[PDB]
Amino acid sequence: VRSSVHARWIVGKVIGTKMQKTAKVRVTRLVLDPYLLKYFNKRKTYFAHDALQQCTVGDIVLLRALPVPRAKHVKHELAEIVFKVGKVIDPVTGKPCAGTTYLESPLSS
Amino acid sequence: NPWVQIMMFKNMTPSPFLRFYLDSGEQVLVDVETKSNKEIMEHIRKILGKNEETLREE
Amino acid sequence: KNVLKIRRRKMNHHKYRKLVKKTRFLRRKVQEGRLRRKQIKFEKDLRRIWLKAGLKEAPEGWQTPKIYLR
Amino acid sequence: DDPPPSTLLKDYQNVPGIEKVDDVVKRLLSLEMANKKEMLKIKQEQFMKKIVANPEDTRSLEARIIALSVKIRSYEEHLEKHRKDKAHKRYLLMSIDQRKKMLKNLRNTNYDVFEKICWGLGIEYTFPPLYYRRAHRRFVTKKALCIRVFQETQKLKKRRR
Amino acid sequence: ELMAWNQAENRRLHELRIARLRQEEREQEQRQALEQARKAEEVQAWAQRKE
Amino acid sequence: ATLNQMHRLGPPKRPPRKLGPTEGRPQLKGVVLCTFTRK
RNA sequence: ACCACGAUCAAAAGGGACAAGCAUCAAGCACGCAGCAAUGCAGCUCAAAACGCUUAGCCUAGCCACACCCCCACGGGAAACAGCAGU
Ligand SMILES: NC(=O)c1ccc[n+]([C@@H]2O[C@H](COP(=O)([O-])OP(=O)(O)OC[C@H]3O[C@@H](n4cnc5c(N)ncnc54)[C@H](O)[C@@H]3O)[C@@H](O)[C@H]2O)c1
Numbered sequence: 001v002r003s004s005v006h007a008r009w010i011v012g013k014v015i016g017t018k019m020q021k022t023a024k025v026r027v028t029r030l031v032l033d034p035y036l037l038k039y040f041n042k043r044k045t046y047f048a049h050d051a052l053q054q055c056t057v058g059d060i061v062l063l064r065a066l067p068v069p070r071a072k073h074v075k076h077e078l079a080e081i082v083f084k085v086g087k088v089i090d091p092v093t094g095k096p097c098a099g100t101t102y103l104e105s106p107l108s109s
Numbered sequence: 110n111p112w113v114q115i116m117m118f119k120n121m122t123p124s125p126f127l128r129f130y131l132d133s134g135e136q137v138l139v140d141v142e143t144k145s146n147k148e149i150m151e152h153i154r155k156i157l158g159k160n161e162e163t164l165r166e167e
Numbered sequence: 168k169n170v171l172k173i174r175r176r177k178m179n180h181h182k183y184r185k186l187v188k189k190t191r192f193l194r195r196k197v198q199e200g201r202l203r204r205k206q207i208k209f210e211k212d213l214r215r216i217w218l219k220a221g222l223k224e225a226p227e228g229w230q231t232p233k234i235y236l237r
Numbered sequence: 238d239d240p241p242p243s244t245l246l247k248d249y250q251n252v253p254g255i256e257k258v259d260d261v262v263k264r265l266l267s268l269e270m271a272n273k274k275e276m277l278k279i280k281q282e283q284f285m286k287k288i289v290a291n292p293e294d295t296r297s298l299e300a301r302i303i304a305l306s307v308k309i310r311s312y313e314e315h316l317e318k319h320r321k322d323k324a325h326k327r328y329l330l331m332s333i334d335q336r337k338k339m340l341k342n343l344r345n346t347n348y349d350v351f352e353k354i355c356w357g358l359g360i361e362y363t364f365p366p367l368y369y370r371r372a373h374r375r376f377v378t379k380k381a382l383c384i385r386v387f388q389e390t391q392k393l394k395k396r397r398r
Numbered sequence: 399e400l401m402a403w404n405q406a407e408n409r410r411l412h413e414l415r416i417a418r419l420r421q422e423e424r425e426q427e428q429r430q431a432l433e434q435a436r437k438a439e440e441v442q443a444w445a446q447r448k449e
Numbered sequence: 450a451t452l453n454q455m456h457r458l459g460p461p462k463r464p465p466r467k468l469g470p471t472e473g474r475p476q477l478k479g480v481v482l483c484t485f486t487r488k
Numbered sequence: 489a490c491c492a493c494g495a496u497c498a499a500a501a502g503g504g505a506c507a508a509g510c511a512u513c514a515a516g517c518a519c520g521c522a523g524c525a526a527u528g529c530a531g532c533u534c535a536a537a538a539c540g541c542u543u544a545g546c547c548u549a550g551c552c553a554c555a556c557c558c559c560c561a562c563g564g565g566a567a568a569c570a571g572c573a574g575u
Pocket residue numbers: 367368369370371535
């Protein structure tokens with residue numbers, strides 16, 4: 001009722017930024033193999049409107065469905081950047097981190 | 110939950126955590142460090158799982 | 168180990184090398200005709216492309232190189 | 238640029254009173270009277286001081302990148318003279334691939350240090366190709382023709398409109 | 399109500415994390431002091447041999 | 450094969466059954482051209 | 489309902505999903521994006537199988553496709569049982 005786009009909220013990795021104000025994002029879902037009964041990753045490509053062109057290749061982003069498609073393949077918009085590439089902020093503690101190590105200690109604050 | 114997009118990330122933060130994105134746009138953060146898998150299941154079932162009453166009604 | 172299989176491989180290979188020696192000249196003509204036809208096919212595919220695009224002729228200055236002639 | 242030959246060895250630079258010695262001793266304890274390895278060590282120390290936050294920590298990814306960059310420069314200098322040294326060509330290519338992997342990890346983990354490493358060492362990071370397939374004569378010629386035909390189609394469309 | 403409960407649980411786990419991190423920092427301080435003394439001794443020996 | 454390889458390859462693809470002299474038909478009508486004997 | 493408020497049913501349009509074999513079909517050749525437009529950028533799909541050839545009505549309270557042929561049917565070939573009985 002709010003949108004004609006099937007996928008409403010999706011999380012992906014940005015794999016392309018060569019289009020103006022548009023980010024090419026790779027979204028992985030878990031699909032059960034009918035024979036092996038094991039979950040494997042299935043990939044799909046989405047084009048997300050990035051008005052400010054703040055997306056970099058490799059960062060994890062959240063995409064929200066547009067009310068209607070603004071182009072043939074652009075049906076989504078960048079709601080936020082969940083993880084900036086190489087600039088991750090730990091949501092649990094709110095401190096910068098490099099991989100599994102704290103760049104700034106939680107105790108310091 | 111076949112229609113819920115589940116995605117995994119490895120060695121990106123010093124501590125493990127779960128994040129749920131809701132249709133309203135609200136985000137639920139669950140810290141799971143020091144917790145057993147059964148505890149995580151119970152917690153997520155309690156906070157975002159349908160209760161048995163709704164399942165029996167369905 | 169299978170010495171029959173290796174001896175069968177030897178006989179098959181030796182017989183094959185006799186055939187190519189006997190018909191070496193006929194093979195060369197077949198190969199050159201095949202290369203001619205393959206070049207013609209490549210040119211036809213290129214022409215199909217610029218015809219479907221809309222151009223009535225080839226792109227200006229373009230000449231289909233001979234990529235198969237030795 | 239290489240360190241000047243008068244520079245002291247890495248192990249003989251903090252010795253007390255090393256400036257109060259004779260000129261002959263200074264020459265003997267300099268890069269002029271040493272193999273290329275000491276000179277590469279001096280490059281590594283200089284790069285560490287110029288780039289990394291803690292020059293003493295050789296265990297960081299940035300330090301490993303600097304060391305492998307020095308090694309790659311040494312291999313390239315060797316191969317300029319030794320064109321037919323296949324083993325050293327292999328070593329150079331393998332080291333380049335390893336440095337690319339380390340740079341990818343650094344970019345994924347610490348972007349600020351990644352930028353500092355890229356600027357300091359003059360490394361231009363490139364993303365890997367998506368597909369690995371031979372570009373034979375037929376494909377290359379066909380792709381060139383397709384690009385030309387697209388250009389001509391664009392010109393004609395501009396003329397029509 | 400459930401969201402508020404989850405947030406409270408997160409805060410409790412954060413307090414426990416702070417306590418554990420403080421203990422780890424104290425132990426790290428002690429160990430680092432020990433190895434720093436050892437490195438200083440090694441540096442002194444290295445410098446003596448060079449002199 | 451590993452589970453990943455099995456998932457990649459997928460279910461076994463059985464080649465189509467070979468058609469015999471009757472071409473998958475019970476019987477066939479025919480006209481005799483010549484009769485003879487074989488050893 | 490018919491006074492519509494709306495329910496039921498269900499086209500066109502938009503999003504998603506959706507058969508089999510062959511990779512000795514490996515590249516497709518304009519397949520994208522941004523801007524009110526003017527126009528600008530050079531991009532888009534693809535070994536997680538694009539593009540292509542071949543096979544087959546299907547997921548059966550039923551559904552899809554066809555209604556002699558040229559996909560279609562202004563038009564042409566031409567004069568139509570793939571309705572029942574029948575030849
Ligand atoms: N074909 C690619 O360009 C490509 C790109 C990314 C990943 N891969 C991965 O490589 C594996 C092999 O794929 P395949 O059986 O279809 O190739 P293949 O062996 O059947 O050969 C076809 C093409 O794939 C290339 N190829 C083969 N092995 C590769 C590899 N390990 N990495 C990259 N390219 C490779 C070959 O150069 C060739 O051009 C797969 O797991 C695939 O996910 C392949």
